[PDB]
């Protein structure tokens, strides 16, 4: 493959002025300072930038880059996007499941993975976990080779690398680049951007493209740059790295002084002549959803600490609540204790559903990378992540809480009241989680999303019906109560609990009210709070919570669909 | 000055095996990989490590390092410890106030600062802010020169530098080291540890100490290391950095192979001969407290966003609370609304006092550095930081909240009730803040401290008297209520509000109770909640809050006194 770029001008303000060159099979490095178009030209060349700002033409063997380009080319990111909770074989299996054709067999996919594992030298670690915070994993030098293997699964002809050595150590980076060079000998065009290499690295490159402030300071073979700068009016002393020498030139030991010298150079003439010589989904919805769900569930099992701890906390808390409220009485304190415990349960569901901010925020970069690369659609990824993570870990605390506290407290001893409480707790958990997703979908920092969730929950708590009586708020302000998830949860729980209860011992309030201000029955308490006594006054809350769930999960999907992937 | 170390063996497991050498006036670099004793020997040499693990002797001009050493030597940290909200002149003024003698005049201190500003080249930025998140500041290249100037205020003879160039750019680092070299010509002994320098840096060193895995691979003049390794059986090719060449040797392009060769070298013989030729508070409590308070208040004014926003939030929230609870009535809903608004106020104070985790956590490194360097005592620093930050920003929200909501809500219209509410809110804020400090004093990560604060506040809220009636809890569990700051706050607010109130219109409950279960008076509500009707039942809560404040601020001071400074 031969990737040729002609008069490329990307504008966002401009970042690339005028860049020309060609890259043939081998090791093509893009060097320069951090400001220049070192990482910009790599994305332009890799079709990982918006073509709206692009001006020139990028060509492959004479034909423009097809729409099938990014699927047939590999692109390795700078930092890691490997699942540290899978294994070196499991990551490659997930990649082969969605990047290869369904016509192939699992035996053929497994042989592809075996050949790729062998070529990289990942045999003795092929079944070890890549490593996370809680899990000890492989060294950072073989995580990079794993990330390179997730791109060679489709066996591309052009392999782009965003800074393959930044973060690695010297002895690691040298082996990584010697691996890249042995790869480039089989016939793959390797295009990367190094940050200040060492001479043991620079001695391997086959072509050098030097950029500075979006200007092309040099382009050609990487071994002739030294002579180019020696004859352009500069001298490099002994024991000085040429890659250091170039950035020392760029710093000042002028930009248009080097750009004009290169434009008047012989390399520029040969490049312009060579550039005027020539020009002159993969898979089904269900397959993608299944594999996204499988990987997200392996990741949830392989990360037991942050999933088991929520269960431990749910049990501990449920036993403490069941010890503090043990044996609810039907006396002067029964209303206060029932209302207080139900309020705590609902608001606890709401505040424990804040970890859903982490669902799409932690893996935003991997999502963007895999969506660009043609792994799956936004719909199947969204649904699989909802099905594997949000569903099973928001249902279980509600079940555990109800099963623990319902009989320690001594609530209404009916099977339907028990299950209505369980379902109501489940719905308020799902609603708070969907709101957290809608707020945090597309973002990259948890802090602001967590703060906004807490502020919204604090306000929704005031309008829930315990701290202020909702029948007493002014009309120009009362309508805000319809935006409270805790209000619907608490209203359903109170309706379910208080219906047939008496609270004045020795007095038959249900028949008649002896004295006008006693609040001796649960119906009186419910009507005094503004609650409807009919069965519709119970399920109205559940339909309002289901509508909230639908609206928030649509906002979260539209925030992922309209997110900038470039 | 001449700093000589002989047969140094620091053990924590061992980090330094056997290190010998001498450093004379000039530029002394300590190179090697990250694992070796590159940063360990620097702290051993600078008296910034515990002498419990030390074995050998470190000497200065033949006399052991006196107790007055760290005050007469400068030590510049790797990252910045300059106050980004002060100015380049203000940082040096704070340093001269506590590092120079009180005998001197302000005119003399100002001339010292002027001479230091001139020698560094900080004239045109001497009155610009160093820069923080919200504030635009000087480049990162002159923040380093500011941090170097805060150590030359006392004009030391030995200047230690922990990686003076790590984080800077190439053209910045070169100027920084050329400044250091011009300094080293006046007669100062400069001792630093570089991470993989470039040849334009290596060409300035006057002595090189190479360490690897706590072993001394080389020590002598920095220009003779090339020949040393060339004659030890290695060759360095052209255009290869010698500092890269050394770490390429250390990596493997064995540790006892280089250690034995150097032990058998001529340099080692000369060093052993030179080492067998020879051996064979500043200021008052009030001054320190005043200056700590002045700097912390300039830092609090210069950071208006995080201090003004708490006032904006206090006003907005107070106006929303005053709009929702506008016009409390003395009817069937008056008890619920009064109890709810008082509960919200107390728990809001408790949860808004979580930002006090940030007080001693954000500047832990600067505190450790300045305590080692002999700036002040733990006592004066602690008191000044409490006096400047915690005091004025925890008193003001209580005042604002009371002044806003008290007359919108229509609470008890007496001057003493108004001021008792203000004082109670103030006390609960101070108590929650002291607890947050006691929890987060000495730590370095906010996340765990914030989580623990929230968990403790959530439990204290259950025992506050609204969600569960405190007279109904079992005896083996009721004693936990005495560990609740919200309980004392809420009890004082309720005692202050409910005393002379009637809540059943048309019924003279205060005379007699017509029907046994009406709860028509505030005294009945207070006794039903377990609250004492006597004036001691009000101030008991304030003495319990004052005792809590004193205990928590003593725990926070003992956690700063017994913190490891090494």
């Amino acid at each position, epitope marked *: 493959a031969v990737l040729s770029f002609h008069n490329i001008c990307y504008r966002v303000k401009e970042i690339l002025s005028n860049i020309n060159g060609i890259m043939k099979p081998g090791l093509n490095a893009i060097l320069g300072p951090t400001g220049g178009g070192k990482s910009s030209l790599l994305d332009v060349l890799a079709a990982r930038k918006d073509p709206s700002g692009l001006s020139g033409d990028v060509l492959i063997n004479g034909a423009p880059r097809p729409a099938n380009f990014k699927c047939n080319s590999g692109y390795v990111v700078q930092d890691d996007v490997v699942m540290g909770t899978l294994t070196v074989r499991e990551n490659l299996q997930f990649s082969a499941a969605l990047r290869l054709a369904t016509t192939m067999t699992n035996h053929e996919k497994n042989e592809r993975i075996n050949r790729v594992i062998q070529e990289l030298g990942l045999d003795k670690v092929a079944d070890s976990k890549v490593g996370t915070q809680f899990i000890r994993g492989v060294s950072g030098g073989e995580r990079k080779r794993t990330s390179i293997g997730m791109e060679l699964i489709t066996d591309p002809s052009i392999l782009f690398l965003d800074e393959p050595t930044t973060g690695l150590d010297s002895s690691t980076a040298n082996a990584v680049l010697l691996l890249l060079k042995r790869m480039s000998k089989q016939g793959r065009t390797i295009i990367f951007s190094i940050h200040q290499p060492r001479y043991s690295i620079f001695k391997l490159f086959d072509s050098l493209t030097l950029l500075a402030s979006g200007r092309l300071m040099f382009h050609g073979p990487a071994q002739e740059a030294l002579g180019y700068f020696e004859s352009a009016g500069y001298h490099c002393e002994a024991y000085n790295n040429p890659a250091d020498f170039f950035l020392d030139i760029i710093n000042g030991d002028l930009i248009e002084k080097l750009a004009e010298i290169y434009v008047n150079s012989s390399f520029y003439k040969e490049t312009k002549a060579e550039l005027h010589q020539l020009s002159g989904y993969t898979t089904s919805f269900c397959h993608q959803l299944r594999w996204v769900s499988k990987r997200s569930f392996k990741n949830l099992l392989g990360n037991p600490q942050a999933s088991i701890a929520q269960i431990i906390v749910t049990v501990v808390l449920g036993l403490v609540i069941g010890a503090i409220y043990f044996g609810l*009485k*039907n*006396d002067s304190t029964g209303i206060q204790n029932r209302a207080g415990v139900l309020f705590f349960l609902t608001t606890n569901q709401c505040f424990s559903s804040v970890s859903a901010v982490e669902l799409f925020v932690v893996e935003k970069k991997l999502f963007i990378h895999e969506y660009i690369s043609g792994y799956y659609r936004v719909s199947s990824y969204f649904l699989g992540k909802l099905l594997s993570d949000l569903l099973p870990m928001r249902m279980l605390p509600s079940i555990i809480f109800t099963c623990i506290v319902y009989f320690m407290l001594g609530l209404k001893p009916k099977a339907d009241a028990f299950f209505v409480m369980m379902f109501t707790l489940m719905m308020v958990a799902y609603s708070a989680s969907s709101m957290a997703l809608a707020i945090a979908a597309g973002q990259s920092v948890v802090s602001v999303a967590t703060l906004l969730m807490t502020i919204c929950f604090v306000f929704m708590m005031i309008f829930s019906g315990l701290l202020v009586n909702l029948t007493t708020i002014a009309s120009w302000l009362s309508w805000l109560q319809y935006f409270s998830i805790p209000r619907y949860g608490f209203t359903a729980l109170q309706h379910n609990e208080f219906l047939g209860q*008496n609270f*004045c*011992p*020795g*007095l*038959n309030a249900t*028949g008649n009210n*002896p*004295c006008n201000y*006693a609040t001796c029955t649960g119906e009186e308490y419910l009507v005094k709070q503004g609650i409807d006594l009919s069965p519709w006054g119970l399920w109205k809350n559940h339909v309002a919570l289901a509508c909230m769930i639908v609206i928030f999960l649509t906002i979260a999907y539209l925030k992922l669909l309209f997110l900038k992937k470039y | 000055a001449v700093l000589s170390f002989h047969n140094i063996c620091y053990r924590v497991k061992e980090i330094l095996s056997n290190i010998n050498g001498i450093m004379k006036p000039g530029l002394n670099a300590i190179l090697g990989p990250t694992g070796g004793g590159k940063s360990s020997l620097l702290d051993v040499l600078a008296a910034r490590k515990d002498p419990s693990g030390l074995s050998g002797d470190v000497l200065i001009n033949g006399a052991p390092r006196p107790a007055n050493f760290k005050c007469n030597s400068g030590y510049v940290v790797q990252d910045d410890v300059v106050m980004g909200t002060l100015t380049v002149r203000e940082n040096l003024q704070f340093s001269a106030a506590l590092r120079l003698a009180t005998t001197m005049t302000n005119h003399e201190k100002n001339e010292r600062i002027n001479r230091v500003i001139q020698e560094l080249g900080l004239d045109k930025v001497a009155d610009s802010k160093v820069g923080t998140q919200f504030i635009r500041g000087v480049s990162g290249g002159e923040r380093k020169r500011t941090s170097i100037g805060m150590e030359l205020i006392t004009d030391p003879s030995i200047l230690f530098l922990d990686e003076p160039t790590t984080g800077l750019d190439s053209s910045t680092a070169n100027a920084v080291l050329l400044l250091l070299k011009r300094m080293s010509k006046q007669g100062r002994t400069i001792i630093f540890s570089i991470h993989q320098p470039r040849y334009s840096i290596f060409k300035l060193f006057d002595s090189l100490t190479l360490l690897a895995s706590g072993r001394l691979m080389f020590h002598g003049p920095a220009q003779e290391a090339l020949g040393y390794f060339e004659s030890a059986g290695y060759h360095c090719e052209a255009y290869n950095n010698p500092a890269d060449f050394f770490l390429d040797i250390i990596n493997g392009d064995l540790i006892e192979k280089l250690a034995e060769i150097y032990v058998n070298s001529s340099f080692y013989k000369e060093t052993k001969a030179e080492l067998h030729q020879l051996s064979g508070y500043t200021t008052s409590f009030c001054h320190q407290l005043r200056w700590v308070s002045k700097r912390s208040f300039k830092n609090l004014l210069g950071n208006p966003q995080a201090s003004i926003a708490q006032i904006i939030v206090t006003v907005v929230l107070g106006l929303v609370i005053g709009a929702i609870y506008f016009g409390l009535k003395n009817d069937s809903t008056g008890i619920q609304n009064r109890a709810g608004v008082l509960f919200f106020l107390t728990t809001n104070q408790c949860f808004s006092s979580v930002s006090a985790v940030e007080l001693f956590v954000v500047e832990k490194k600067l505190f450790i550095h300045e305590y080692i360097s002999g700036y002040y005592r733990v006592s004066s620093y602690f008191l000044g930081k409490l006096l400047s930050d915690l005091l004025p920003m925890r008193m003001l929200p209580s005042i604002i909240f009371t002044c806003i909501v008290y007359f919108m809500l229509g609470l008890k219209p007496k001057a003493d009730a108004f001021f008792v509410m203000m004082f109670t809110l103030m006390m609960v804020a101070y108590s929650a803040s002291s607890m947050a400090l006691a929890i987060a004093a000495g730590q370095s990560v906010v996340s765990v401290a914030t989580l623990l604060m929230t968990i403790c506040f959530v439990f204290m809220m259950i025992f506050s008297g609204l969600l569960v009636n405190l007279t109904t809890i079992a005896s083996w569990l009721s004693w936990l209520q005495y560990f609740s700051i919200p309980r004392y706050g809420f009890t004082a607010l309720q005692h202050n509000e409910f005393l002379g109130q009637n809540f059943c219109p048309g019924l003279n409950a205060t005379g*007699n*109770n017509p*029907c*046994n*279960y009406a709860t028509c008076t505030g*005294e*009945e509500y207070l*006794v039903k909640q377990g609250i004492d*009707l006597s004036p001691w039942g009000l101030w008991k809560n304030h003495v319990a809050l004052a005792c809590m404040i004193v205990i928590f601020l003593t725990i926070a001071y003992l956690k700063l006194l017994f913190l490891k400074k090494y």
Partner: antibody
Amino acid sequence: VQLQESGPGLVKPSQSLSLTCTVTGFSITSDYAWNWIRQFPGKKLEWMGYINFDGGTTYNPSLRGRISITRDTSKNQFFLQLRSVTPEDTATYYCATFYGAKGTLDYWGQGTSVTVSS
Amino acid sequence: DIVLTQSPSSFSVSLGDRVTISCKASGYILNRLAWYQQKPGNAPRLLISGATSLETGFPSRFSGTGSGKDYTLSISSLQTEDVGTYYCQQYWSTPWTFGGGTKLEIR
């Protein structure tokens, strides 16, 4: 409205005590709460517990697990069973009625003597 | 719980005389106080409820006055049908407790 105790006037230690109160003139399922009280020799009154008009019950905590109060609406009775009896609870036992809206014990029984001996 | 204390475990008066009985509680009762009169051989009989209200069936010689924790029962111009024992009972908290009782005598 009209209460009447009945039961054994003498009981072996550590076996049980069972009294019956039959109510005439009012329905024990209609309004009030229905209590047991005992007066010791060397007069000292002690409230034992009650059963509510809806069957709920409440006991004095100084009788831990020793007392139960049941009822039989078919003939308007409520029963006191005090198990594992000692010679200390040789009192006079009364059944009384508690209105609730008023708060006081308004109607009492005649009282029956129980002697725990051997 | 709430313990009710009557200081004069016994008294001694004559006819036409005025007598006052005191009851002291160990906690705030808020007028949830009742007075019972027991003759020898009979169950207690409710005399005062609400610490002030008098029961129908008793002369206007008994009166109740109290607040907080101190309550009193005043029998002015006592007759011979008034001799007996007098108990105070609180009905504020669920374990209802009686006072020790105060027996009246005749000189």
